[PDB]
Design an enzyme around this catalytic site. Structure first.
Site, PDB file in Angstrom:
ATOM      1  N   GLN A  64      35.793-131.923  31.552  1.00 41.17           N
ATOM      2  CA  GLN A  64      36.873-130.950  31.441  1.00 41.17           C
ATOM      3  C   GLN A  64      37.782-131.231  30.250  1.00 41.17           C
ATOM      4  OE1 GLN A  64      35.973-132.531  34.213  1.00 41.17           O
ATOM      5  NE2 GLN A  64      35.529-130.996  35.794  1.00 41.17           N
TER       6      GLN A  64
ATOM      7  N   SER B 132      46.840-111.692  41.022  1.00 40.58           N
ATOM      8  CA  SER B 132      47.062-112.173  42.379  1.00 40.58           C
ATOM      9  C   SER B 132      45.783-111.960  43.177  1.00 40.58           C
ATOM     10  CB  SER B 132      48.241-111.455  43.043  1.00 40.58           C
ATOM     11  OG  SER B 132      48.512-112.002  44.321  1.00 40.58           O
TER      12      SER B 132
ATOM     13  N   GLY C  42      28.281-131.222  38.927  1.00 43.60           N
ATOM     14  CA  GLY C  42      27.936-132.083  37.808  1.00 43.60           C
ATOM     15  C   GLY C  42      28.192-133.548  38.100  1.00 43.60           C
ATOM     16  N   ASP C  43      29.329-133.849  38.735  1.00 47.54           N
ATOM     17  CA  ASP C  43      29.614-135.228  39.121  1.00 47.54           C
ATOM     18  C   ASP C  43      28.516-135.775  40.020  1.00 47.54           C
ATOM     19  OD1 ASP C  43      32.027-135.134  37.692  1.00 47.54           O
ATOM     20  OD2 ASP C  43      33.140-134.391  39.430  1.00 47.54           O
TER      21      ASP C  43
ATOM     22  N   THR D 187      23.315-130.760  31.276  1.00 50.24           N
ATOM     23  CA  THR D 187      23.071-129.937  32.450  1.00 50.24           C
ATOM     24  C   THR D 187      23.125-128.465  32.068  1.00 50.24           C
ATOM     25  OG1 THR D 187      25.406-129.923  33.089  1.00 50.24           O
ATOM     26  CG2 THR D 187      24.028-131.710  33.932  1.00 50.24           C
ATOM     27  N   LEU D 188      22.296-127.666  32.738  1.00 50.10           N
ATOM     28  CA  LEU D 188      22.117-126.266  32.375  1.00 50.10           C
ATOM     29  C   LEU D 188      22.356-125.351  33.570  1.00 50.10           C
ATOM     30  CD1 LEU D 188      18.731-126.966  30.568  1.00 50.10           C
ATOM     31  CD2 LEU D 188      20.967-126.872  29.426  1.00 50.10           C
TER      32      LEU D 188
HETATM   33  O1  LIG Z   1      34.422-132.475  38.885  1.00 54.69           O
HETATM   34  C1  LIG Z   1      35.448-131.824  39.577  1.00 54.69           C
HETATM   35  C2  LIG Z   1      36.583-132.629  39.635  1.00 54.69           C
HETATM   36  O2  LIG Z   1      37.417-132.536  38.429  1.00 54.69           O
HETATM   37  C3  LIG Z   1      38.583-132.838  38.740  1.00 54.69           C
HETATM   38  N1  LIG Z   1      39.241-132.248  37.654  1.00 54.69           N
HETATM   39  C4  LIG Z   1      39.402-130.993  37.449  1.00 54.69           C
HETATM   40  N2  LIG Z   1      39.936-130.817  36.287  1.00 54.69           N
HETATM   41  C5  LIG Z   1      40.114-131.971  35.717  1.00 54.69           C
HETATM   42  C6  LIG Z   1      40.636-132.423  34.479  1.00 54.69           C
HETATM   43  C7  LIG Z   1      41.180-131.377  33.436  1.00 54.69           C
HETATM   44  C8  LIG Z   1      41.576-130.613  32.675  1.00 54.69           C
HETATM   45  C9  LIG Z   1      42.111-129.578  31.645  1.00 54.69           C
HETATM   46  C10 LIG Z   1      42.488-129.996  30.364  1.00 54.69           C
HETATM   47  C11 LIG Z   1      42.972-129.060  29.433  1.00 54.69           C
HETATM   48  C12 LIG Z   1      43.078-127.738  29.782  1.00 54.69           C
HETATM   49  C13 LIG Z   1      43.611-126.712  28.759  1.00 54.69           C
HETATM   50  C14 LIG Z   1      44.950-126.393  28.739  1.00 54.69           C
HETATM   51  C15 LIG Z   1      45.422-125.484  27.834  1.00 54.69           C
HETATM   52  C16 LIG Z   1      44.537-124.874  26.918  1.00 54.69           C
HETATM   53  C17 LIG Z   1      43.196-125.195  26.938  1.00 54.69           C
HETATM   54  C18 LIG Z   1      42.724-126.101  27.843  1.00 54.69           C
HETATM   55  C19 LIG Z   1      42.704-127.320  31.058  1.00 54.69           C
HETATM   56  C20 LIG Z   1      42.216-128.259  31.993  1.00 54.69           C
HETATM   57  N3  LIG Z   1      40.669-133.689  34.241  1.00 54.69           N
HETATM   58  C21 LIG Z   1      40.221-134.553  35.102  1.00 54.69           C
HETATM   59  N4  LIG Z   1      39.703-134.171  36.247  1.00 54.69           N
HETATM   60  C22 LIG Z   1      39.656-132.889  36.580  1.00 54.69           C
HETATM   61  C23 LIG Z   1      38.721-132.186  40.208  1.00 54.69           C
HETATM   62  O3  LIG Z   1      39.591-133.114  40.811  1.00 54.69           O
HETATM   63  C24 LIG Z   1      37.551-132.073  40.687  1.00 54.69           C
HETATM   64  O4  LIG Z   1      37.176-132.774  41.915  1.00 54.69           O
HETATM   65  O1  LIG Z   2      58.288-112.912  46.923  1.00 55.96           O
HETATM   66  C1  LIG Z   2      57.606-114.119  46.738  1.00 55.96           C
HETATM   67  C2  LIG Z   2      57.086-114.540  47.947  1.00 55.96           C
HETATM   68  O2  LIG Z   2      55.849-113.827  48.261  1.00 55.96           O
HETATM   69  C3  LIG Z   2      55.158-114.556  48.988  1.00 55.96           C
HETATM   70  N1  LIG Z   2      53.936-113.914  48.827  1.00 55.96           N
HETATM   71  C4  LIG Z   2      53.205-113.925  47.769  1.00 55.96           C
HETATM   72  N2  LIG Z   2      52.201-113.118  47.946  1.00 55.96           N
HETATM   73  C5  LIG Z   2      52.273-112.554  49.125  1.00 55.96           C
HETATM   74  C6  LIG Z   2      51.509-111.610  49.877  1.00 55.96           C
HETATM   75  C7  LIG Z   2      50.193-111.011  49.256  1.00 55.96           C
HETATM   76  C8  LIG Z   2      49.231-110.570  48.805  1.00 55.96           C
HETATM   77  C9  LIG Z   2      47.931-109.974  48.196  1.00 55.96           C
HETATM   78  C10 LIG Z   2      47.339-108.890  48.782  1.00 55.96           C
HETATM   79  C11 LIG Z   2      46.157-108.347  48.232  1.00 55.96           C
HETATM   80  C12 LIG Z   2      45.597-108.916  47.090  1.00 55.96           C
HETATM   81  C13 LIG Z   2      44.306-108.324  46.486  1.00 55.96           C
HETATM   82  C14 LIG Z   2      43.082-108.851  46.829  1.00 55.96           C
HETATM   83  C15 LIG Z   2      41.938-108.327  46.296  1.00 55.96           C
HETATM   84  C16 LIG Z   2      42.012-107.243  45.393  1.00 55.96           C
HETATM   85  C17 LIG Z   2      43.238-106.716  45.050  1.00 55.96           C
HETATM   86  C18 LIG Z   2      44.380-107.239  45.583  1.00 55.96           C
HETATM   87  C19 LIG Z   2      46.192-110.004  46.500  1.00 55.96           C
HETATM   88  C20 LIG Z   2      47.368-110.545  47.049  1.00 55.96           C
HETATM   89  N3  LIG Z   2      51.901-111.302  51.063  1.00 55.96           N
HETATM   90  C21 LIG Z   2      52.983-111.794  51.571  1.00 55.96           C
HETATM   91  N4  LIG Z   2      53.727-112.646  50.900  1.00 55.96           N
HETATM   92  C22 LIG Z   2      53.395-113.052  49.688  1.00 55.96           C
HETATM   93  C23 LIG Z   2      55.420-116.012  48.354  1.00 55.96           C
HETATM   94  O3  LIG Z   2      55.314-116.816  49.506  1.00 55.96           O
HETATM   95  C24 LIG Z   2      56.560-115.969  47.778  1.00 55.96           C
HETATM   96  O4  LIG Z   2      57.673-116.796  48.235  1.00 55.96           O
END
Ligand SMILES: OC[C@H]1O[C@@H](n2cnc3c(C#Cc4ccc(-c5ccccc5)cc4)ncnc32)[C@H](O)[C@@H]1O
Ligand SMILES: OC[C@H]1O[C@@H](n2cnc3c(C#Cc4ccc(-c5ccccc5)cc4)ncnc32)[C@H](O)[C@@H]1O
Ligand code: NA
Ligand code: NA
Lengths: 314, 313
Positions: free
Chosen positions: A163, A27, A247-248, A214-215
Site C-alpha cells: 500500500q 454516502s 495478498g498477505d 500477484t495477478l
Molecule cells: O493487507 C491488508 C492490511 O493492510 C493494512 N493496511 C491497509 N492500508 C495500509 C497502509 C497504507 C496506506 C496509504 C498510504 C498512502 C495513501 C495516499 C494518500 C494520499 C494520496 C495518495 C495515497 C493511502 C493509503 N499501510 C500499512 N498497512 C495498511 C490493513 O490493516 C489490512 O489488514
Molecule cells: O447529521 C449527522 C448525523 O447523521 C448520522 N447519520 C449519518 N447518516 C445517517 C443515515 C443514512 C443513510 C443512507 C441511506 C441510504 C444510502 C444509499 C445506499 C445505496 C444507494 C444510495 C443511497 C446511504 C446512506 N441515517 C441516519 N443517520 C445518519 C450521523 O450519525 C451523524 O451524527
C-alpha cells in the site's frame, strides 16, 4: 525463522450490497460491520504461525494490543519485539467493499508511526539472525531503516511495500529494492514501481533474486533474473467474500513453503491456497486451517502429486 | 416539550489532508476520533444545552450507557430510548477532506429496531409533546412515527435528511403531508420535488413552513403564501468539520421557536449553533458560551437581534 515487519492494525470492515457508482459527498448504506485483527505484518505473522512456521512480529502498536498479542502468541508468533506506544493507539484500517470486491478505504497510522524507533539489531540480539526479514507496508522511515539495517547486518530481506508505494517517491522505492531476496507486488503496483523508479524490468531484475507479481484472479508470476518464469493459477474460489489480506496470505503461505524447503512452484501453490482461504472469509485472520480440505483443494487445482508434496511439509 | 426521533449512533470521523480527487480508493488520514452522534442525538443534545425540554426517542444498543449519562447531564429525557437485546448502536463512518467534502458509510444496526417504538407510549409517559421531529431513522419507523403523529394530533417536523436517497417517491410523499415544518437542504429539496413528482406549490399546500438550508448561503424560510425570509450564515473562523451542522441549525431554530421567537430570530439562533458545530470536530463537541453567542449574533445580525435572541436563554 522469519521476522515480519509492517503495520499492526484493527480492520473495520463493512459490506456495501451495491456497486460503487457515484459520478463531492459519497454516502454508502452498508449491511455488515465487523472489527478484526489486521495490519500486513500481523496478517502474515498469523498465517506463518498457523502453518507451523517460526515467526516473529516486529511492529508498532498501542496499549490495546494485549488481546491481539494473546491471539498471535496462541498460534506460535513471537510478539516480544512489538513496540508498544504509551500514548498512540494501534493503526486502524477502515474499508467498505462492494459486490464486485471493489474497495473504498481509509488508513489511520497512529502507533504505526513509531515503528521507526524499532531496531532489528535488538531483535537479532534476542533471537539470533532470522533467515528472512519481510519489509512490509509500514511507517515509511521505518521501512527504510529496516532495509538499511538488513543490508548492514547481512540479513536477507523481502521488499513488500504494497500500500505504501502510493505514498513513497521514486528515490524512496529505489532505496527499498536493491539487494532484496524477494520483491513482492501486484501487477498494477509493478507498473507503478517501474514508472516511479524510472527503472526498466531488467534494471529491477538485476538487483533482486526473485520477483513475485500477484495477478489477482489470473494467479501469480515468479520471475528469476535470468528470465525463468513460473505462472501459478489461483485455487478457484467457491465465493468472493472479501479481498482484504489476500495478498498477505499468499506471501505468508509462499514464504512458509520456501522456509520448508519447497520449490518455487509448490510454494506458490500453497500460497494460492491460503490466499483463497482468506478470499472466502471476512477479515484477514478469520480463516481456518483444515489439513484434509487443504490437500483436497490443492489436488483439485494442481494435481495429487503437487498436493502430496505440499502437505508433506505441514 | 420537543420529542426527537431519529438515528442514535457513534460517529467515527477521519480527516483526509488532501482533496477528494482520485475501483480502489484509499485515503491516508491524519485524524481519527470517535464521538456521539446520530441526528436525533445531535438535535436532542443541542436542545438540552440551549435550555429546552426535550426527549430522545430512538433505538440504541446496550453500549448506550455513557451516551445516556451525557445526554441526561444536558437535560435530555432518555427514558424512551429503545435498547436492543443484540444489536449495537448504529455507526457513521466518515472521511472529510480540506474542502469539507465527505465520503461516508452508515451501518444502521440497532437503528432498525426503531420501528418497534410507539409514540403513544411516550405520550402516555410525558404527555403530548409540542413538536415531534421525524429525523433520519429506520424508514418504517419514520412512517409509523409520522402516521402516529397524525393519529394522535401531534404536530411534527418532517426531517428525512440522509434517508431521502433511500426512500421512494410514494414514501417521501407519505412523510410530508400535515407537517408543521419541512426541513431539507437545497439539493434535498430538488431531489424531493423530483422523486415525489410534486411542484413547489404542491408541497407548500401541505405544510405550514418550508425550511431549506443552503450551506454557506444561509437558509430560506418559506411560508405557504410565499412570504420568504433569508438568513445568512454566522461567518465562520474555520471550517473544521461539516458533520451535524444541519442538525444543530434545526435544534437552535426549533429551540428559538419553542421560546416564542419569530422565524427570523429563530433562524439566526440556529445559524449560530450551526457555525459552532462547523467549527469543531464531532456533532456535540461544541461549547455554549453566552457572551460569545451574544457577540457573534450581534456582529452578524445587529445588536437588537442579538439582545432579543439572548433574552430567552
Ligand atoms: O493487507 C491488508 C492490511 O493492510 C493494512 N493496511 C491497509 N492500508 C495500509 C497502509 C497504507 C496506506 C496509504 C498510504 C498512502 C495513501 C495516499 C494518500 C494520499 C494520496 C495518495 C495515497 C493511502 C493509503 N499501510 C500499512 N498497512 C495498511 C490493513 O490493516 C489490512 O489488514
Ligand atoms: O447529521 C449527522 C448525523 O447523521 C448520522 N447519520 C449519518 N447518516 C445517517 C443515515 C443514512 C443513510 C443512507 C441511506 C441510504 C444510502 C444509499 C445506499 C445505496 C444507494 C444510495 C443511497 C446511504 C446512506 N441515517 C441516519 N443517520 C445518519 C450521523 O450519525 C451523524 O451524527
Ligand atoms: Na478477507
Ligand atoms: Na462538526
Amino acid at each position: 525463522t522469519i521476522a515480519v515487519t509492517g503495520s499492526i492494525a484493527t480492520d473495520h470492515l463493512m459490506r456495501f450490497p451495491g456497486r460503487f457508482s457515484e459520478q463531492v459527498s459519497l454516502s454508502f448504506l452498508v449491511d455488515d460491520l465487523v472489527m478484526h485483527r489486521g495490519g500486513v505484518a500481523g496478517n502474515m505473522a498469523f498465517a506463518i504461525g498457523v502453518l507451523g512456521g517460526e515467526v516473529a512480529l516486529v511492529g508498532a502498536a498501542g496499549a490495546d494490543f494485549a488481546d491481539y498479542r494473546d491471539w498471535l502468541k496462541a498460534r506460535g508468533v513471537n510478539c516480544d519485539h512489538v513496540l508498544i506506544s504509551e500514548t498512540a493507539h494501534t493503526a486502524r484500517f477502515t474499508c467498505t467493499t462492494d459486490v464486485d470486491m471493489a474497495q473504498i478505504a481509509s488508513f489511520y497510522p497512529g502507533a504505526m508511526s513509531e515503528a521507526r524507533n524499532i531496531k532489528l539489531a535488538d531483535v537479532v540480539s534476542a533471537i539470533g539472525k532470522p533467515e528472512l526479514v519481510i519489509i512490509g507496508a509500514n511507517d515509511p522511515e521505518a521501512m527504510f531503516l529496516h532495509t538499511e539495517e538488513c543490508r548492514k547486518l547481512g540479513l536477507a530481506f523481502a521488499a513488500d511495500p504494497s500500500q505504501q508505494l502510493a505514498r513513497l517517491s521514486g528515490e524512496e522505492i529505489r532505496r527499498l529494492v536493491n539487494g532484496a531476496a524477494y520483491l513482492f507486488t501486484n501487477d498494477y503496483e509493478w507498473d507503478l514501481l517501474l514508472s516511479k523508479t524510472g527503472w526498466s524490468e531488467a534494471d529491477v531484475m538485476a538487483q533482486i533474486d526473485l520477483r513475485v507479481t500477484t495477478l489477482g484472479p489470473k494467479g501469480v508470476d515468479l520471475v528469476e533474473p535470468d528470465g525463468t518464469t513460473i505462472h501459478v493459477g489461483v485455487v478457484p474460489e467457491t465465493s468472493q467474500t472479501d479481498p482484504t489480506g489476500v495478498g498477505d496470505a499468499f506471501r505468508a503461505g509462499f514464504l512458509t513453503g520456501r522456509s520448508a524447503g519447497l520449490g518455487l512452484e509448490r510454494s506458490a501453490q500453497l500460497g494460492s491456497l491460503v490466499a483463497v482461504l482468506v478470499l472466502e472469509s471476512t477479515g484477514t485472520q478469520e480463516w481456518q486451517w483444515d489439513y484434509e480440505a487443504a490437500a483436497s483443494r490443492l489436488a483439485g487445482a494442481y494435481g495429487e502429486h503437487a498436493a502430496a508434496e505440499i502437505v508433506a511439509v505441514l
